[PDB]
TrEMBL record, chain B:
One of its GO terms (molecular function) is S-adenosylmethionine-dependent methyltransferase activity. Keywords: Methyltransferase, S-adenosyl-L-methionine, Transferase. S-adenosyl-L-homocysteine binds at residues 18, 33-34, 76, 97, 124-125. The gene is mitM. The keyword RNA-binding does not apply. This is MitM.
Length: 269, 266
């Protein structure tokens, strides 16, 4: 249960934490703002290729193709969004609440020669400025974590999703009650980057509230968390801006990262 | 969650129902008592290979091999238990509350040459006659739907599973509240086969209670229910027991079939 507390992260305030960070060193030009995925804890694929692997894993669950309309909910500096449009030929509308993020993602699309296939826009998933049933698929890649109310966001997704459309997302969750030594570092994370964390059984009724049926819940904690936290702390400490420590999380084994797929009943074109 | 009336099945009464099923041949040697799985709605892969398809997909999630000890938690006439022993080289121990099923399952093991690697015995998953940390993996293939209490059944699995071992089960569930028309067919189905049904959010606490972490939840309704129910009614139409169509269940989109994987921590 959610014993270790939660910040209540704010939309146009998470866009300040990251108008600061997706800029000046946490993210400049072509970076995935999410964990890597590795086939075995001993695989030594570089981080960049494992980040795109998580993207690709999730894009395949969208079940899209050229001419598909994808909504990119929380788009970072745009690396997964323009990747999906380039590899699949689908059309991508991404939204961010940070201005720097919109600017950088639109630059990435343009550098790719795709400024019209991938378009990025200032908008808030709490209140989606898109008409009903305008999207074939929605991807929220490491982004619902930063959002204030999962219930509202999920209802917005379910309104703009066409029937038969699919939502695929990642999220933090509690695999089992947390060790006490670990909860210090799990709230230092959740609080210093304005994140919350749900219970696994929270999602079925959340999703049902928004018109979606859970299709897939997949714990990918053992393929994502540790190796990324290692590779990042080895970066930060081999470089002589604050004291965010990944390692304190390495091994707090009850901390969990989940891939989820929900579907809006009906069927598509 | 709490709309349809469900029986609360008793082990020995389910054993008696299925003894009668088995002893006629309704469940005959080498037959699977579970849904087919199909990758797309129109593929014409026949029922038997679709049924083995589900077995193989669940068996690979066990993550087992030659010399794994596998508990076949509710085994039927033995067909998937002996198939797993034949194709993977593991040691399968299966159980049923049905005496006639246990007989057919040992019979199947004998005819395949695997009576030493696939064993079956009468038992109840509420009270597992097995040591702690005895099994590398448990599989419960459409079996828990007939069992009396999921929390206790899961506690047993948790106790006999070894650290790092996995539970793979299927189960019935409510995808969304049932339209009135639907629950007509579903209620008599749950009743007439001594089965119950859960909710997707039910399992993560149930699993936890038993010391098990949820690893995979998968709605496989659209690959299993409709095509299976339809082929079954078309050949029960061939039969011209006031028994059932399974067809009154087709088109009840809210009735669901789930595949689930949980682990015991290393």
């Amino acid at each position: 249960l959610s014993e270790l507390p939660m910040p209540s992260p704010a939309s146009e305030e998470v866009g300040a934490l990251y108008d600061r960070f997706t800029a000046l060193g946490a993210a400049s030009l072509g970076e995935n703002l999410h964990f890597g995925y590795w086939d075995s804890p001993d695989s030594q694929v570089p981080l960049a290729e494992a980040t795109d692997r998580l993207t690709d894993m999730m894009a395949e669950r969208l079940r899209i193709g050229a001419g598909s309309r994808v909504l990119d909910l929380g788009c970072g500096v745009g690396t997964p969004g323009v990747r999906i449009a380039r590899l699949s030929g689908a059309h991508v509308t991404g939204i961010s609440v940070s201005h720097e993020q919109v600017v950088r993602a639109n630059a990435l699309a343009e550098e790719a020669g795709l400024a019209d296939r991938a378009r990025f826009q200032r908008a808030d998933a709490m209140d989606l400025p898109f008409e009903d049933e305008s999207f074939d698929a929605v991807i929220a890649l490491e982004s619902i974590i930063h959002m204030p109310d999962r219930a509202q966001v999920l209802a917005q997704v379910g309104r703009v999703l066409r029937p038969g459309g699919r939502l695929v997302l990642t999220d933090f969750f509690e695999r089992a009650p947390l060790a006490p030594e670990g909860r210090a570092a799990v709230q230092r994370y959740l609080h210093d980057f304005m994140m919350t964390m749900v219970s696994a059984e929270a999602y079925p009724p959340l999703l049902r509230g928004a018109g979606l049926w859970l299709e897939e819940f997949l714990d990918i904690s053992d393929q994502t968390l540790e190796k990324t936290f290692r590779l990042l702390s080895e970066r930060i400490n081999s470089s002589k801006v604050n004291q965010f420590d990944p390692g304190d999380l390495v091994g707090v084994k009850e901390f969990g990262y989940l891939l989820l797929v929900a579907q809006r009943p009906g069927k598509h074109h």
